Amino acid sequence: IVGGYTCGANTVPYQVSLNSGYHFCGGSLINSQWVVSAAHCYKSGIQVRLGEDNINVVEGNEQFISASKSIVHPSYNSNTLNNDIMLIKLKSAASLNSRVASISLPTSCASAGTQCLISGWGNTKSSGTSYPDVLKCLKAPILSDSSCKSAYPGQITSNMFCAGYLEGGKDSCQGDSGGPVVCSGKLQGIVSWGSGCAQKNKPGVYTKVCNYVSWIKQTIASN
């Protein structure tokens, strides 16, 4: 997260870190045994780390649970990032409490101008690299489809939306991939892609979760 702020320990209790001997992506807990992340985060050997604030210190409240299943959307296209969504099943259920909590899925799509909370342990610099210890947060609005397509001509599908800023300085970044965009208490986005990070005229692009609610529920019910 570039241009954000320190969230505060466990203030984003649905945020998870995906770990493969290092933090590599975020995700969102949607029930005690399932996480939503980005398809471009898929790999074998995922350990889901819940309850984290400082990802480099055992502070208490952490739960580390291996993934038993990762399910990339069957229509994910890695060249366009269309359908950039993946479900991760936990080997055992997380213990839910005030610091480890699920986030509701949308009942309808969000509208342009809605302010959302984006979070993660990704890069905090728009030039160069710095990765934080503690979870970072950014308040960011959903942009109009027209502004999004103007920024990324030919690249925005119906399964994507833009959020953030056009003036530069505030965005998600590498290592935030797969993490949440929460608006009015609902998981509306997944950190997916962008040109650089926090660059002028190049907002963040996010998977449009409201298009996948039925697919999520059926995939969970069948697994």
Ligand SMILES: N=C(N)N1CCC(CNC(=O)[C@@H]2CCCN2C(=O)[C@H](N)Cc2ccccc2)CC1
């Ligand atoms: N500014 C941000 N809000 N983000 C936040 C998310 C991160 C991490 N996500 C990536 O790095 C994804 C994974 C694959 C390539 N890619 C890109 O974003 C490419 N730059 C553009 C692209 C290439 C091919 C297809 C679709 C898009 C990037 C910065």
Ligand SMILES: [Ca+2]
């Ligand atoms: Ca920790």
